Design a protein around this ligand. Sequence first.
Ligand SMILES: C/C=C/C/C=C/CCC(=O)[C@@H](O)CC(N)=O
Ligand SMILES: C/C=C/C/C=C/CCC(=O)[C@@H](O)CC(N)=O
Ligand SMILES: [Mn+2]
Ligand SMILES: [Mn+2]
Ligand SMILES: [Mn+2]
Ligand SMILES: [Mn+2]
Ligand SMILES: [Xe]
Ligand SMILES: [Xe]
Ligand SMILES: [Xe]
Ligand SMILES: [Xe]
Lengths: 334, 334
Amino acid sequence: LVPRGSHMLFQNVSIAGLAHIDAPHTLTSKEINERLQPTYDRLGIKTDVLGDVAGIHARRLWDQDVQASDAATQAARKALIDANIGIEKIGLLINTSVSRDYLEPSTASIVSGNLGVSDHCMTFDVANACLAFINGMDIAARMLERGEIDYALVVDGETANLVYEKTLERMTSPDVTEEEFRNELAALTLGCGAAAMVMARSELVPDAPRYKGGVTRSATEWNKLTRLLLIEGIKLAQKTFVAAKQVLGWAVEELDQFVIHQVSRPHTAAFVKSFGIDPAKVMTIFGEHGNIGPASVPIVLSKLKELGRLKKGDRIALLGIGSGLNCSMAEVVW
Amino acid sequence: LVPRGSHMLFQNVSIAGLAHIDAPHTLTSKEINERLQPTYDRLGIKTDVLGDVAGIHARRLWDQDVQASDAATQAARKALIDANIGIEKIGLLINTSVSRDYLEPSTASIVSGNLGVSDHCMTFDVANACLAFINGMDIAARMLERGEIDYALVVDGETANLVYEKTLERMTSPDVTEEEFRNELAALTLGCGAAAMVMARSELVPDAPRYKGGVTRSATEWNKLTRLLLIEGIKLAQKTFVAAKQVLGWAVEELDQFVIHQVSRPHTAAFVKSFGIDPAKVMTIFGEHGNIGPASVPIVLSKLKELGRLKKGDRIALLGIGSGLNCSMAEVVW
Ligand SMILES: C/C=C/C/C=C/CCC(=O)[C@@H](O)CC(N)=O
Ligand SMILES: C/C=C/C/C=C/CCC(=O)[C@@H](O)CC(N)=O
Ligand SMILES: [Mn+2]
Ligand SMILES: [Mn+2]
Ligand SMILES: [Mn+2]
Ligand SMILES: [Mn+2]
Ligand SMILES: [Xe]
Ligand SMILES: [Xe]
Ligand SMILES: [Xe]
Ligand SMILES: [Xe]
């Protein structure tokens, strides 16, 4: 009768498989600047905003015209192998990427068709900026927990190639301001990549990592969004951390890893300081891969696994602040 | 221990409120043709494809530059009034429209900000072509059923104005084929409008309509998709109807209303004939409103309510065939 935080946690949802794809083509910030230099000089800016402001030394791009669905498909094939199961076991496939093939059909239906899902497989896309992979995990988790399905795929492929092309062109244009130039530099922190996760009812995969679920808080009053964005973002994260304490029983020091979506080096710096987090428990790929949007979290989790910096029983925080503003925080126990 | 179809149905999820918005501006197919006539003649086509092929006499457009989020917001305000509850009760807001304000943030976060949702309110978009409102209902239903929330908004605003403008321009172009002209005529069956639904835990709204849930089947092998589309669509719907029999206990004759997404008059005709459905139990707005995409189903349900052609105990089938291909069928008991 009496509600407790732990009541809303999932008891029988696990991570059966997990994979990521690193996009092959390394584009250094060194090169981008060589191309921007006549516009840096021309604008009188001695600031390497990319290398030691945003703190990005390189990002990965695709080598060819890879569609979001292609990248998600490749990651999904890898995750199925990791889980050691055939596509026929999948009852749900959710796509969570920002990158999108078409207006319709859903990117999820395209990935599903590529993989050869059965006619029982439910598919749809979830869109929520940088937090959507966590949303997709949670949505799949509720179907698993309820027993509507036994296995689910959550996939996310991101391509920034066209953005980089369109963006590099507008910033080397003659009639471009220092405002625009700055307003567009942000696109140049984005990276390509993909990730997929197979989730399953725990009894089908004894001893697999457990997904407990998590909490979300929002500040949609700020959906219009600068230092203001960092300040409101941190304030939202503070209140989300209170919710996490109330549901997950989180204390910053009892967590073993923080898998955090990253916007820039100084953003992550401000967050880590605000919460008193030990920076050693925060793996970062932003410096060499840039911001891979909603794929960032599972890619980092996947890299931790393969490295392999994870041990059974480890408490792993998954979190991010997304446009909205929204903030989500969820726990995996390895 | 032993699974039964009825087990996966929701027992404590109801529809607390429901509203629709009719877009104000009537554009008759008469007018569109007056503008297309020099291209009909020029192409030697005596075929009024719109009026007595697709069977659309008129569709509604917006009078001004209405964004999806604006239309969804207006419908949501109306649904809250219908449910007699303040926005502060809402723990989840899902947007399901095809029309989309920006790449980010989600359209849902924009609507939420407009309405003034509390910081506890979770938001995200679901994208799945014409079936997404049903997906959003189901996603909200699982959170309600589980007790994670007490009230949810599912909203959907559609705007076709720009499509109609871009489309009318390409079909009155000199160098346009009869193929292209036909390949684009389809955009001219789309209409504008909006709908929103407040869902709630049944005990909070005794005697409100009950949402039971439903089933989905897919044929993602056909995600590339003509008479072929109709044939595969009907075949998919046949198998989805078997699933509905197995879960919902559906027999065509025991249903009181069929709320069906509509692509065109001959499409709906073929469907109704294939299933032996009494056409009198199928309200249609396509002739005067066109195809409002994923908003079509809740708009028709909302019009049935206000008319009011619904009585307590009525078994109401919600269904559609969407790009993917996917097909979903769910039941509401009024
Ligand atoms: C630590 C403070 C964070 C400020 C918030 C920035 C928004 C981040 C982005 O714009 C993208 O990286 C992802 C997103 N918005 O969902
Ligand atoms: C009855 C047979 C239906 C054929 C399927 C057509 C696809 C319909 C559409 O293209 C849109 O109206 C909605 C959608 N695809 O989700
Ligand atoms: Mn290369
Ligand atoms: Mn373990
Ligand atoms: Mn008008
Ligand atoms: Mn009743
Ligand atoms: Xe895993
Ligand atoms: Xe945290
Ligand atoms: Xe209702
Ligand atoms: Xe049906």
